[PDB]
Amino acid sequence: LKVNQDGSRVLLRDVAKIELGGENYDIIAEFNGQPASGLGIKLATGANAL
Amino acid sequence: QLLAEAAKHPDMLTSVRPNGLEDTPQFKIDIDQEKAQALGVSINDINTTL
């Protein structure tokens, strides 16, 4: 991020936590009570369901 | 691995080959961020110069 007056370094890791984590955190699903994810699929218009 | 085994059944497979190109030499240039910041040279001027 920057070099201080005395030549010491400020790394991003010194002012932030860094972690893989969701683009968003709003949806959480469960299947018969255990952690899950999944896809909800909607049918294009006029397409055959089966 | 696959191409080597294909080559061992000439009785069955022939001219089994990649369609594409093979890795080649290229030039790795590393911009040293600390030295850039210490000289007051912006990364954007560096990268568009290059």
B23 has a chain A CB within 8 A of its CB: no
Task: Kindly determine whether residue A9 and residue B37, on different chains, have CB atoms separated by under 8 Å.
Answer: no
Nearest chain B CA: its distance from A3 CA (Å): 7
Instruction: Concatenate the DSSP letters of all residues of B1-50 into one string.
Output: -HHHHHTT-TTT--S---SS------------HHHHHHHT--HHHHHHH-
Task: Kindly determine whether residue A9 and residue B38, on different chains, have CB atoms separated by under 8 Å.
Answer: no
Contact residues on chain A for B38, CB-CB shorter than 8 A:
3
A43: CB partners within 8 A, 6+ apart: A49
